[PDB]
């Protein structure tokens, strides 16, 4: 019932690539380029992974990438490692000057 729609889960084996989608509306994800992705290991603080759709903060490996098409943003994790197993949340600015989150996606590394 969150404003942004994410798949509940995703899975991959080490070395593979997985894509997580984040679908909003023209009022948020589609109307602006302030889409962020955060990685959360349960019981720890979220960590910023992608900002402004495709930018990576310093210290985040280039295996993590971001893109957007229409009202859907996407985070891709290539060269999957065991420590990538975590919950991933997207977020977006909205035309109402608020920030909304996606419901989160559990990423499991086999």
């Amino acid at each position: 019932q969150s404003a942004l729609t994410q798949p509940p889960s995703a899975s991959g084996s080490p070395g593979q690539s997985v894509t997580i989608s984040c679908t909003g509306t023209s009022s948020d994800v589609g109307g602006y380029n302030y889409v962020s992705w955060y990685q959360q290991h349960p019981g720890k603080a979220p960590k910023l992974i992608i900002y402004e759709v495709s930018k990576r903060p310093s210290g985040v490996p280039d295996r993590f990438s971001g893109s957007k098409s229409g009202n859907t943003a996407s985070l891709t994790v290539s060269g999957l490692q065991a420590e990538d197993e975590a919950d991933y949340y997207c977020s977006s600015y909205t035309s109402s000057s608020t920030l909304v989150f996606g419901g989160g996606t559990k990423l499991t590394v086999l």
Binding site: S2, Y38, P46, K47, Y89, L99, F101, G102
Partner: protein, 119 residues
């Protein structure tokens, strides 16, 4: 190095109040907004609103209007969140999160979170 240190776990009864602190180091506290995010156990992140460290003006999310108060003590680089009339549904982890420059709609650093359990 940028860091947000939050105060410890809290255990409260319904009707009580609680004050959580978020101490900022590694930058000018007053140069960037401070945001508040709730995560009930097992649930997703919810944006509670933000406070301008420039003026002290707080802006609450629609769902967090009424019982929640954002405040500041810039002299100890600390932002506070107080929850009044605590109820069972308030049991959650509360994070402070810094607004990344220049417009602050990205949260680049997060506090470690404070668990509040309402019995």
């Amino acid at each position: 190095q940028v860091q947000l240190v939050q105060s410890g776990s809290e255990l409260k009864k319904p009707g009580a109040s609680v004050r959580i602190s978020c101490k900022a180091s590694g930058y000018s506290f007053t140069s960037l907004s401070m945001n508040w995010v709730r995560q009930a156990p097992g649930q997703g992140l919810e944006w509670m609103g933000w406070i301008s460290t420039k003026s002290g003006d707080p802006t609450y999310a629609q769902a967090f209007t009424g019982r929640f108060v954002f405040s500041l003590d810039t002299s100890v680089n600390t932002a506070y969140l107080q929850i009044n009339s605590l109820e069972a549904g308030d049991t959650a982890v509360y994070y402070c999160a810094r607004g990344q420059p220049p417009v602050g709609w990205t949260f680049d650093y997060w506090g470690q979170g404070t668990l509040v359990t309402v019995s």
